[PDB]
Amino acid sequence: GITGTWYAQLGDTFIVTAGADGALTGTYEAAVGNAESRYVLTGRYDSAPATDGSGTALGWTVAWKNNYRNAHSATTWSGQYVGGAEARINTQWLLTSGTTEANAWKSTLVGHDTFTKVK
Amino acid sequence: EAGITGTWYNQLGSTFIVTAGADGALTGTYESAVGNAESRYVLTGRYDSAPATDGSGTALGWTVAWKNNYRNAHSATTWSGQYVGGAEARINTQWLLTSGTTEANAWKSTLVGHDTFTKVK
Amino acid sequence: GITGTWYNQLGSTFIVTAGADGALTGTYESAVGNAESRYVLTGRYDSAPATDGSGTALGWTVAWKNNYRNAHSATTWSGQYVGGAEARINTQWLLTSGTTEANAWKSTLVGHDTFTKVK
Amino acid sequence: GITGTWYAQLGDTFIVTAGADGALTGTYEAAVGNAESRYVLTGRYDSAPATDGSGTALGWTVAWKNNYRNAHSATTWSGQYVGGAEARINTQWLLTSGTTEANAWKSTLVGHDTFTKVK
């Protein structure tokens, strides 16, 4: 299932719960251990996916502010959960920083990340 | 407060209502252009609740999964962008829309676009 | 309809020829005036588009190196030409910088631009 | 070097020549089929990259029209070449289809692909 602890290619970890209603709620930790690198995450998923072998669509956001740090930026991940033995969540993400109007053209990075339940 | 809480309209007529929490939470309801109650979906997200005061915008993002009690598109959109407050407040976003696919078909799983929202229409 | 001079909302301009064979060839000026700000553009377009009112798919690339400057970057624009009283090319773009593998996660910006045809 | 034959995860292949002047030219072949599935590619690359362990920025376009078929669409790939033992080209891409105005919101797919010179 989606609920659990997930690991990114380069060590990021996130813990999420998938609610009956389609909610995602949890915490995203940018660096292994370390209280100062944990951030709130919230999102949504398709709680009644197709039964044709497709994945389950989802997305979530982290604003990079906690009680210790603020990067004045937020990342959204959009993707799907693929169940099985080696369950995976495959994503593409957008990272937007607060900018002046003149710098808005360079406000947003794009990338991709794959998460697995194994370290 | 920050001026995010309220009702916002995009260039295509979609509208959303949002409440910005003092802690960084975004909650609300997104209504696609066509349909009324059949077209309302849950939205949830996060924003920078302590933004810079140097002329920069306020970073945010939110997600809508396209399932409600009427319809299910087996898809979800995430919007990433910044809020520009004041007299002519706007939220400028780029978005990704992922539909559930097999891995073989994942190359056609994700659309990209951009939406600008105003508190006016 | 594509052949000609085009300008975007932020002031950049380009001049392009759409060849009978599908080629796009031209010059991109990142800043109106200023002859040290011209770069080679090349790309491709659909030379036999649908006749149902749909736009014409196209794309092009500029590497940001010329005789005077080198940003070690390249932008690609993907979009469609929409004919009209005021013709437009509506695009989304990706700007990738050369990075170390460690910084590859922040190698690529994403944005959008609309160009309007001069005269 | 960039010049050579490259392979994608799910069977696409392309052949490219990198000119001394920053030009990319070649042919892209979709996974299934052959000449029916071969298309012209053109692009640009940084012909003098940084000497600091950074990759080499590049981009190219394919319009999905050849003598046999026409999908009324085009893909642009933006990325970088990373040299050495296992040389790779890492990209993100945008695929735009010609659409009516009402369908323009869903004109553009986004993805990512890595290419290698090995099988």
GROMACS .gro file of N, CA, C and O in nm, chain C:
model
  476
  241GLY      N    1   0.342   3.031  -4.249
  241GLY     CA    2   0.303   3.126  -4.147
  241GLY      C    3   0.408   3.143  -4.038
  241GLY      O    4   0.414   3.247  -3.971
  242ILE      N    5   0.491   3.041  -4.022
  242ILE     CA    6   0.594   3.042  -3.918
  242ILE      C    7   0.711   3.135  -3.956
  242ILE      O    8   0.767   3.204  -3.870
  243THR      N    9   0.751   3.134  -4.083
  243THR     CA   10   0.865   3.214  -4.126
  243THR      C   11   0.842   3.362  -4.097
  243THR      O   12   0.738   3.420  -4.134
  244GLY      N   13   0.940   3.424  -4.032
  244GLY     CA   14   0.932   3.563  -3.992
  244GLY      C   15   0.999   3.593  -3.860
  244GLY      O   16   1.085   3.514  -3.815
  245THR      N   17   0.964   3.708  -3.802
  245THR     CA   18   1.022   3.756  -3.678
  245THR      C   19   0.918   3.750  -3.567
  245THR      O   20   0.802   3.787  -3.587
  246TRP      N   21   0.962   3.702  -3.452
  246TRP     CA   22   0.873   3.675  -3.339
  246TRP      C   23   0.928   3.739  -3.211
  246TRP      O   24   1.049   3.746  -3.192
  247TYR      N   25   0.838   3.781  -3.122
  247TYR     CA   26   0.883   3.838  -2.996
  247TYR      C   27   0.798   3.793  -2.881
  247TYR      O   28   0.677   3.773  -2.896
  248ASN      N   29   0.864   3.776  -2.767
  248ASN     CA   30   0.798   3.727  -2.646
  248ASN      C   31   0.768   3.839  -2.551
  248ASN      O   32   0.810   3.951  -2.572
  249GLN      N   33   0.694   3.804  -2.446
  249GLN     CA   34   0.647   3.900  -2.345
  249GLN      C   35   0.762   3.971  -2.272
  249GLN      O   36   0.746   4.085  -2.229
  250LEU      N   37   0.876   3.905  -2.260
  250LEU     CA   38   0.988   3.959  -2.182
  250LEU      C   39   1.092   4.030  -2.268
  250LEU      O   40   1.195   4.072  -2.218
  251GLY      N   41   1.064   4.042  -2.398
  251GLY     CA   42   1.148   4.121  -2.486
  251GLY      C   43   1.238   4.043  -2.582
  251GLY      O   44   1.288   4.100  -2.678
  252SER      N   45   1.259   3.914  -2.558
  252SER     CA   46   1.343   3.837  -2.649
  252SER      C   47   1.278   3.837  -2.787
  252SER      O   48   1.156   3.844  -2.797
  253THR      N   49   1.359   3.827  -2.892
  253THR     CA   50   1.308   3.816  -3.028
  253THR      C   51   1.384   3.709  -3.103
  253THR      O   52   1.499   3.681  -3.073
  254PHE      N   53   1.319   3.647  -3.201
  254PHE     CA   54   1.388   3.554  -3.291
  254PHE      C   55   1.339   3.569  -3.434
  254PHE      O   56   1.229   3.618  -3.459
  255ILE      N   57   1.424   3.530  -3.528
  255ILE     CA   58   1.388   3.531  -3.671
  255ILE      C   59   1.413   3.392  -3.721
  255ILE      O   60   1.518   3.331  -3.692
  256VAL      N   61   1.316   3.336  -3.792
  256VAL     CA   62   1.319   3.195  -3.829
  256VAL      C   63   1.266   3.173  -3.971
  256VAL      O   64   1.177   3.245  -4.016
  257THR      N   65   1.324   3.074  -4.038
  257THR     CA   66   1.272   3.017  -4.163
  257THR      C   67   1.224   2.875  -4.143
  257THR      O   68   1.297   2.789  -4.094
  258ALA      N   69   1.099   2.851  -4.181
  258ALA     CA   70   1.041   2.719  -4.183
  258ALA      C   71   1.058   2.662  -4.323
  258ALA      O   72   0.993   2.708  -4.417
  259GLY      N   73   1.147   2.565  -4.337
  259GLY     CA   74   1.179   2.506  -4.466
  259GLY      C   75   1.077   2.404  -4.513
  259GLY      O   76   1.002   2.348  -4.433
  260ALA      N   77   1.071   2.380  -4.643
  260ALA     CA   78   0.966   2.296  -4.699
  260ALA      C   79   0.969   2.156  -4.642
  260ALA      O   80   0.868   2.087  -4.640
  261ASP      N   81   1.087   2.119  -4.594
  261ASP     CA   82   1.121   1.985  -4.546
  261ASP      C   83   1.095   1.961  -4.396
  261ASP      O   84   1.114   1.849  -4.347
  262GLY      N   85   1.056   2.064  -4.323
  262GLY     CA   86   1.033   2.048  -4.181
  262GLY      C   87   1.139   2.115  -4.094
  262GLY      O   88   1.128   2.112  -3.970
  263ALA      N   89   1.241   2.175  -4.154
  263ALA     CA   90   1.347   2.238  -4.075
  263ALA      C   91   1.309   2.378  -4.027
  263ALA      O   92   1.245   2.455  -4.100
  264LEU      N   93   1.350   2.410  -3.904
  264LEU     CA   94   1.354   2.546  -3.854
  264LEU      C   95   1.501   2.590  -3.841
  264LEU      O   96   1.582   2.519  -3.779
  265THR      N   97   1.533   2.704  -3.898
  265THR     CA   98   1.667   2.763  -3.890
  265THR      C   99   1.655   2.913  -3.868
  265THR      O  100   1.569   2.980  -3.927
  266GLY      N  101   1.738   2.968  -3.782
  266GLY     CA  102   1.731   3.110  -3.751
  266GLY      C  103   1.827   3.156  -3.643
  266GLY      O  104   1.927   3.086  -3.612
  267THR      N  105   1.797   3.275  -3.590
  267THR     CA  106   1.881   3.345  -3.493
  267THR      C  107   1.792   3.392  -3.377
  267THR      O  108   1.686   3.450  -3.401
  268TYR      N  109   1.836   3.365  -3.254
  268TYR     CA  110   1.763   3.407  -3.134
  268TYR      C  111   1.840   3.519  -3.066
  268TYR      O  112   1.959   3.503  -3.038
  269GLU      N  113   1.773   3.630  -3.040
  269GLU     CA  114   1.832   3.745  -2.972
  269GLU      C  115   1.775   3.757  -2.831
  269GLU      O  116   1.659   3.788  -2.815
  270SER      N  117   1.858   3.731  -2.730
  270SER     CA  118   1.808   3.724  -2.593
  270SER      C  119   1.770   3.863  -2.542
  270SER      O  120   1.693   3.876  -2.446
  271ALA      N  121   1.823   3.966  -2.607
  271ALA     CA  122   1.794   4.103  -2.566
  271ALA      C  123   1.790   4.194  -2.688
  271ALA      O  124   1.892   4.211  -2.754
  272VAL      N  125   1.673   4.251  -2.716
  272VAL     CA  126   1.654   4.347  -2.825
  272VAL      C  127   1.768   4.449  -2.828
  272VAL      O  128   1.813   4.496  -2.723
  273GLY      N  129   1.814   4.485  -2.947
  273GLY     CA  130   1.938   4.560  -2.961
  273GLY      C  131   2.051   4.463  -2.929
  273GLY      O  132   2.030   4.343  -2.934
  274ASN      N  133   2.169   4.515  -2.897
  274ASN     CA  134   2.279   4.433  -2.846
  274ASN      C  135   2.313   4.313  -2.936
  274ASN      O  136   2.255   4.205  -2.924
  275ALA      N  137   2.412   4.332  -3.023
  275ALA     CA  138   2.448   4.229  -3.120
  275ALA      C  139   2.534   4.116  -3.061
  275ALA      O  140   2.562   4.017  -3.128
  276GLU      N  141   2.577   4.132  -2.935
  276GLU     CA  142   2.652   4.028  -2.866
  276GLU      C  143   2.557   3.926  -2.800
  276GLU      O  144   2.600   3.834  -2.731
  277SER      N  145   2.427   3.944  -2.823
  277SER     CA  146   2.328   3.860  -2.759
  277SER      C  147   2.255   3.774  -2.862
  277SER      O  148   2.142   3.733  -2.836
  278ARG      N  149   2.318   3.745  -2.976
  278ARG     CA  150   2.258   3.659  -3.077
  278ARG      C  151   2.314   3.517  -3.077
  278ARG      O  152   2.437   3.496  -3.067
  279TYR      N  153   2.224   3.420  -3.090
  279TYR     CA  154   2.259   3.279  -3.083
  279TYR      C  155   2.190   3.199  -3.194
  279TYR      O  156   2.077   3.234  -3.236
  280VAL      N  157   2.254   3.091  -3.238
  280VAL     CA  158   2.198   3.003  -3.341
  280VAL      C  159   2.075   2.930  -3.285
  280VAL      O  160   2.081   2.879  -3.174
  281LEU      N  161   1.967   2.925  -3.363
  281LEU     CA  162   1.852   2.836  -3.334
  281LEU      C  163   1.829   2.733  -3.445
  281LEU      O  164   1.841   2.765  -3.564
  282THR      N  165   1.803   2.609  -3.406
  282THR     CA  166   1.761   2.508  -3.499
  282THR      C  167   1.652   2.423  -3.437
  282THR      O  168   1.648   2.404  -3.315
  283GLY      N  169   1.564   2.373  -3.523
  283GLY     CA  170   1.453   2.291  -3.478
  283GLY      C  171   1.377   2.226  -3.592
  283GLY      O  172   1.425   2.215  -3.705
  284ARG      N  173   1.257   2.180  -3.560
  284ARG     CA  174   1.174   2.104  -3.654
  284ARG      C  175   1.027   2.145  -3.636
  284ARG      O  176   0.986   2.187  -3.529
  285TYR      N  177   0.948   2.133  -3.742
  285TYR     CA  178   0.804   2.158  -3.732
  285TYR      C  179   0.730   2.062  -3.822
  285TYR      O  180   0.787   2.006  -3.915
  286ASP      N  181   0.600   2.047  -3.796
  286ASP     CA  182   0.513   1.965  -3.880
  286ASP      C  183   0.482   2.041  -4.008
  286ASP      O  184   0.409   2.141  -4.004
  287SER      N  185   0.538   1.996  -4.122
  287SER     CA  186   0.519   2.066  -4.247
  287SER      C  187   0.390   2.029  -4.320
  287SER      O  188   0.364   2.081  -4.428
  288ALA      N  189   0.308   1.942  -4.259
  288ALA     CA  190   0.177   1.905  -4.317
  288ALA      C  191   0.075   1.891  -4.205
  288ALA      O  192   0.029   1.780  -4.177
  289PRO      N  193   0.039   2.002  -4.141
  289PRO     CA  194  -0.046   1.995  -4.022
  289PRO      C  195  -0.191   1.962  -4.056
  289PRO      O  196  -0.228   1.966  -4.174
  290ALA      N  197  -0.269   1.929  -3.954
  290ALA     CA  198  -0.411   1.900  -3.970
  290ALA      C  199  -0.482   2.022  -4.024
  290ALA      O  200  -0.438   2.136  -4.004
  291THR      N  201  -0.595   2.001  -4.091
  291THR     CA  202  -0.671   2.111  -4.148
  291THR      C  203  -0.804   2.131  -4.073
  291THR      O  204  -0.899   2.189  -4.128
  292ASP      N  205  -0.809   2.087  -3.948
  292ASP     CA  206  -0.929   2.093  -3.867
  292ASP      C  207  -0.928   2.209  -3.768
  292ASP      O  208  -1.008   2.210  -3.674
  293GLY      N  209  -0.836   2.304  -3.786
  293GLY     CA  210  -0.825   2.418  -3.696
  293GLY      C  211  -0.717   2.403  -3.588
  293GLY      O  212  -0.692   2.497  -3.510
  294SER      N  213  -0.657   2.286  -3.581
  294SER     CA  214  -0.552   2.257  -3.484
  294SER      C  215  -0.428   2.337  -3.517
  294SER      O  216  -0.407   2.372  -3.633
  295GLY      N  217  -0.346   2.364  -3.415
  295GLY     CA  218  -0.217   2.429  -3.432
  295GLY      C  219  -0.117   2.340  -3.501
  295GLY      O  220  -0.140   2.221  -3.520
  296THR      N  221  -0.002   2.399  -3.532
  296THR     CA  222   0.110   2.331  -3.596
  296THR      C  223   0.218   2.303  -3.493
  296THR      O  224   0.279   2.397  -3.442
  297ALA      N  225   0.244   2.175  -3.465
  297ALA     CA  226   0.346   2.137  -3.365
  297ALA      C  227   0.487   2.174  -3.413
  297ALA      O  228   0.522   2.161  -3.531
  298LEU      N  229   0.570   2.216  -3.318
  298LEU     CA  230   0.707   2.254  -3.349
  298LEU      C  231   0.796   2.251  -3.224
  298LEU      O  232   0.748   2.241  -3.112
  299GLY      N  233   0.926   2.260  -3.245
  299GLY     CA  234   1.015   2.277  -3.133
  299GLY      C  235   1.148   2.329  -3.183
  299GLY      O  236   1.178   2.312  -3.302
  300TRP      N  237   1.227   2.391  -3.095
  300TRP     CA  238   1.362   2.432  -3.132
  300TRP      C  239   1.454   2.442  -3.011
  300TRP      O  240   1.409   2.444  -2.897
  301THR      N  241   1.584   2.452  -3.038
  301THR     CA  242   1.685   2.455  -2.934
  301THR      C  243   1.777   2.573  -2.959
  301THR      O  244   1.807   2.607  -3.076
  302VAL      N  245   1.817   2.639  -2.850
  302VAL     CA  246   1.931   2.732  -2.855
  302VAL      C  247   2.031   2.689  -2.747
  302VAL      O  248   1.994   2.680  -2.630
  303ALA      N  249   2.157   2.665  -2.786
  303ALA     CA  250   2.267   2.651  -2.689
  303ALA      C  251   2.326   2.792  -2.668
  303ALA      O  252   2.353   2.865  -2.765
  304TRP      N  253   2.342   2.832  -2.542
  304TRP     CA  254   2.373   2.970  -2.506
  304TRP      C  255   2.523   2.998  -2.511
  304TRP      O  256   2.582   3.049  -2.414
  305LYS      N  257   2.580   2.965  -2.625
  305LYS     CA  258   2.723   2.993  -2.656
  305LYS      C  259   2.725   3.065  -2.789
  305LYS      O  260   2.666   3.016  -2.885
  306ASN      N  261   2.796   3.177  -2.795
  306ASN     CA  262   2.825   3.245  -2.922
  306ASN      C  263   2.970   3.294  -2.914
  306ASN      O  264   3.045   3.246  -2.830
  307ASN      N  265   3.008   3.388  -3.001
  307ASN     CA  266   3.147   3.432  -3.006
  307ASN      C  267   3.191   3.512  -2.884
  307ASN      O  268   3.311   3.531  -2.862
  308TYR      N  269   3.095   3.562  -2.807
  308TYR     CA  270   3.124   3.653  -2.697
  308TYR      C  271   3.100   3.595  -2.559
  308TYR      O  272   3.161   3.642  -2.462
  309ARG      N  273   3.010   3.497  -2.547
  309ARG     CA  274   2.964   3.452  -2.417
  309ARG      C  275   2.934   3.302  -2.419
  309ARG      O  276   2.907   3.245  -2.523
  310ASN      N  277   2.945   3.238  -2.304
  310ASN     CA  278   2.907   3.099  -2.293
  310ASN      C  279   2.852   3.074  -2.154
  310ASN      O  280   2.925   3.079  -2.055
  311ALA      N  281   2.721   3.049  -2.149
  311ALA     CA  282   2.651   3.020  -2.023
  311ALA      C  283   2.649   2.871  -1.986
  311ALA      O  284   2.596   2.834  -1.881
  312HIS      N  285   2.707   2.786  -2.069
  312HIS     CA  286   2.709   2.642  -2.047
  312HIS      C  287   2.568   2.589  -2.019
  312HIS      O  288   2.543   2.517  -1.920
  313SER      N  289   2.477   2.628  -2.107
  313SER     CA  290   2.335   2.595  -2.092
  313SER      C  291   2.269   2.584  -2.229
  313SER      O  292   2.325   2.629  -2.330
  314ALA      N  293   2.147   2.530  -2.232
  314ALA     CA  294   2.068   2.523  -2.356
  314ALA      C  295   1.922   2.522  -2.320
  314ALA      O  296   1.883   2.455  -2.223
  315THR      N  297   1.843   2.591  -2.401
  315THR     CA  298   1.697   2.590  -2.383
  315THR      C  299   1.631   2.518  -2.499
  315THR      O  300   1.671   2.535  -2.616
  316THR      N  301   1.531   2.436  -2.470
  316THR     CA  302   1.444   2.387  -2.574
  316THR      C  303   1.304   2.436  -2.551
  316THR      O  304   1.253   2.437  -2.439
  317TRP      N  305   1.241   2.480  -2.659
  317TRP     CA  306   1.102   2.523  -2.659
  317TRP      C  307   1.017   2.421  -2.737
  317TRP      O  308   1.049   2.386  -2.852
  318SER      N  309   0.907   2.376  -2.677
  318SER     CA  310   0.816   2.283  -2.740
  318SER      C  311   0.678   2.350  -2.747
  318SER      O  312   0.630   2.402  -2.646
  319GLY      N  313   0.616   2.354  -2.864
  319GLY     CA  314   0.486   2.420  -2.866
  319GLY      C  315   0.412   2.408  -2.997
  319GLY      O  316   0.433   2.314  -3.071
  320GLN      N  317   0.323   2.504  -3.022
  320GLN     CA  318   0.247   2.505  -3.147
  320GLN      C  319   0.224   2.645  -3.198
  320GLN      O  320   0.207   2.740  -3.120
  321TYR      N  321   0.228   2.657  -3.331
  321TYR     CA  322   0.196   2.780  -3.403
  321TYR      C  323   0.045   2.783  -3.423
  321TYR      O  324  -0.015   2.683  -3.464
  322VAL      N  325  -0.014   2.897  -3.388
  322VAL     CA  326  -0.157   2.920  -3.399
  322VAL      C  327  -0.178   3.041  -3.489
  322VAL      O  328  -0.154   3.155  -3.446
  323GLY      N  329  -0.227   3.017  -3.611
  323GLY     CA  330  -0.247   3.125  -3.706
  323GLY      C  331  -0.364   3.212  -3.664
  323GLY      O  332  -0.454   3.171  -3.587
  324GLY      N  333  -0.364   3.336  -3.712
  324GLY     CA  334  -0.468   3.430  -3.673
  324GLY      C  335  -0.439   3.568  -3.726
  324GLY      O  336  -0.338   3.590  -3.794
  325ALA      N  337  -0.527   3.662  -3.696
  325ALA     CA  338  -0.504   3.803  -3.726
  325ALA      C  339  -0.376   3.847  -3.657
  325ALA      O  340  -0.293   3.916  -3.716
  326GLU      N  341  -0.361   3.805  -3.531
  326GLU     CA  342  -0.232   3.810  -3.464
  326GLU      C  343  -0.181   3.665  -3.443
  326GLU      O  344  -0.226   3.597  -3.350
  327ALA      N  345  -0.086   3.620  -3.524
  327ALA     CA  346  -0.037   3.483  -3.512
  327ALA      C  347   0.047   3.467  -3.386
  327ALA      O  348   0.114   3.559  -3.345
  328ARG      N  349   0.044   3.347  -3.328
  328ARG     CA  350   0.115   3.322  -3.202
  328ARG      C  351   0.187   3.188  -3.208
  328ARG      O  352   0.146   3.098  -3.280
  329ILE      N  353   0.298   3.179  -3.134
  329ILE     CA  354   0.357   3.049  -3.102
  329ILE      C  355   0.356   3.037  -2.948
  329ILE      O  356   0.417   3.117  -2.877
  330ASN      N  357   0.279   2.939  -2.899
  330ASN     CA  358   0.264   2.914  -2.756
  330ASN      C  359   0.356   2.799  -2.717
  330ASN      O  360   0.347   2.691  -2.776
  331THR      N  361   0.444   2.822  -2.620
  331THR     CA  362   0.546   2.724  -2.586
  331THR      C  363   0.555   2.697  -2.437
  331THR      O  364   0.514   2.780  -2.355
  332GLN      N  365   0.607   2.579  -2.408
  332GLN     CA  366   0.670   2.547  -2.281
  332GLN      C  367   0.816   2.519  -2.307
  332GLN      O  368   0.853   2.475  -2.418
  333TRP      N  369   0.899   2.549  -2.209
  333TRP     CA  370   1.043   2.539  -2.230
  333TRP      C  371   1.115   2.474  -2.112
  333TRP      O  372   1.066   2.476  -1.998
  334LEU      N  373   1.231   2.416  -2.143
  334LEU     CA  374   1.323   2.355  -2.047
  334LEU      C  375   1.462   2.417  -2.068
  334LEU      O  376   1.512   2.417  -2.179
  335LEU      N  377   1.522   2.468  -1.962
  335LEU     CA  378   1.658   2.523  -1.968
  335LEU      C  379   1.750   2.436  -1.881
  335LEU      O  380   1.739   2.438  -1.759
  336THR      N  381   1.839   2.360  -1.945
  336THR     CA  382   1.934   2.274  -1.873
  336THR      C  383   2.072   2.338  -1.874
  336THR      O  384   2.124   2.380  -1.980
  337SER      N  385   2.130   2.348  -1.755
  337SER     CA  386   2.272   2.388  -1.740
  337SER      C  387   2.360   2.266  -1.722
  337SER      O  388   2.321   2.168  -1.659
  338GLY      N  389   2.482   2.269  -1.774
  338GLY     CA  390   2.580   2.168  -1.736
  338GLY      C  391   2.608   2.173  -1.586
  338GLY      O  392   2.634   2.279  -1.532
  339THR      N  393   2.599   2.057  -1.521
  339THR     CA  394   2.620   2.045  -1.376
  339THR      C  395   2.706   1.922  -1.347
  339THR      O  396   2.720   1.830  -1.426
  340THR      N  397   2.763   1.921  -1.226
  340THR     CA  398   2.819   1.799  -1.174
  340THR      C  399   2.706   1.702  -1.146
  340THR      O  400   2.589   1.742  -1.135
  341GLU      N  401   2.739   1.574  -1.133
  341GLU     CA  402   2.636   1.474  -1.109
  341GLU      C  403   2.568   1.502  -0.975
  341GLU      O  404   2.447   1.483  -0.960
  342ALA      N  405   2.643   1.553  -0.879
  342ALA     CA  406   2.585   1.586  -0.749
  342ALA      C  407   2.478   1.694  -0.756
  342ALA      O  408   2.387   1.697  -0.673
  343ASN      N  409   2.491   1.787  -0.851
  343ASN     CA  410   2.394   1.897  -0.865
  343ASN      C  411   2.294   1.877  -0.977
  343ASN      O  412   2.221   1.970  -1.013
  344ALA      N  413   2.290   1.756  -1.030
  344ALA     CA  414   2.204   1.727  -1.144
  344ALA      C  415   2.057   1.749  -1.106
  344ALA      O  416   1.976   1.786  -1.191
  345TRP      N  417   2.023   1.732  -0.979
  345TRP     CA  418   1.884   1.756  -0.939
  345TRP      C  419   1.839   1.900  -0.963
  345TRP      O  420   1.719   1.926  -0.976
  346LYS      N  421   1.932   1.995  -0.973
  346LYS     CA  422   1.897   2.135  -0.998
  346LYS      C  423   1.950   2.187  -1.133
  346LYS      O  424   1.977   2.306  -1.152
  347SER      N  425   1.961   2.095  -1.227
  347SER     CA  426   2.012   2.128  -1.360
  347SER      C  427   1.909   2.195  -1.450
  347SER      O  428   1.949   2.262  -1.546
  348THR      N  429   1.779   2.177  -1.423
  348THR     CA  430   1.678   2.211  -1.525
  348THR      C  431   1.563   2.300  -1.478
  348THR      O  432   1.485   2.258  -1.394
  349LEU      N  433   1.554   2.420  -1.534
  349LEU     CA  434   1.436   2.507  -1.515
  349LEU      C  435   1.328   2.481  -1.619
  349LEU      O  436   1.357   2.441  -1.732
  350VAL      N  437   1.204   2.504  -1.580
  350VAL     CA  438   1.089   2.492  -1.669
  350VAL      C  439   1.008   2.621  -1.665
  350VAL      O  440   0.997   2.689  -1.560
  351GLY      N  441   0.954   2.657  -1.782
  351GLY     CA  442   0.872   2.777  -1.793
  351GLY      C  443   0.787   2.774  -1.919
  351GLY      O  444   0.772   2.669  -1.984
  352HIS      N  445   0.730   2.889  -1.952
  352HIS     CA  446   0.642   2.900  -2.065
  352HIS      C  447   0.658   3.040  -2.123
  352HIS      O  448   0.686   3.135  -2.050
  353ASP      N  449   0.643   3.049  -2.254
  353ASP     CA  450   0.653   3.176  -2.326
  353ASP      C  451   0.555   3.176  -2.442
  353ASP      O  452   0.540   3.075  -2.511
  354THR      N  453   0.492   3.291  -2.466
  354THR     CA  454   0.413   3.309  -2.585
  354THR      C  455   0.479   3.412  -2.674
  354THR      O  456   0.518   3.520  -2.627
  355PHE      N  457   0.496   3.378  -2.801
  355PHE     CA  458   0.555   3.470  -2.896
  355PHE      C  459   0.449   3.520  -2.991
  355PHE      O  460   0.360   3.444  -3.030
  356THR      N  461   0.463   3.646  -3.029
  356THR     CA  462   0.373   3.707  -3.126
  356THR      C  463   0.450   3.748  -3.251
  356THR      O  464   0.563   3.791  -3.242
  357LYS      N  465   0.388   3.733  -3.368
  357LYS     CA  466   0.456   3.762  -3.493
  357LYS      C  467   0.458   3.910  -3.519
  357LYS      O  468   0.358   3.979  -3.503
  358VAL      N  469   0.573   3.961  -3.559
  358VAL     CA  470   0.583   4.102  -3.595
  358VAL      C  471   0.524   4.126  -3.733
  358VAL      O  472   0.544   4.045  -3.825
  359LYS      N  473   0.453   4.238  -3.746
  359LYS     CA  474   0.378   4.275  -3.866
  359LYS      C  475   0.278   4.167  -3.906
  359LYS      O  476   0.160   4.174  -3.869
   0.00000   0.00000   0.00000
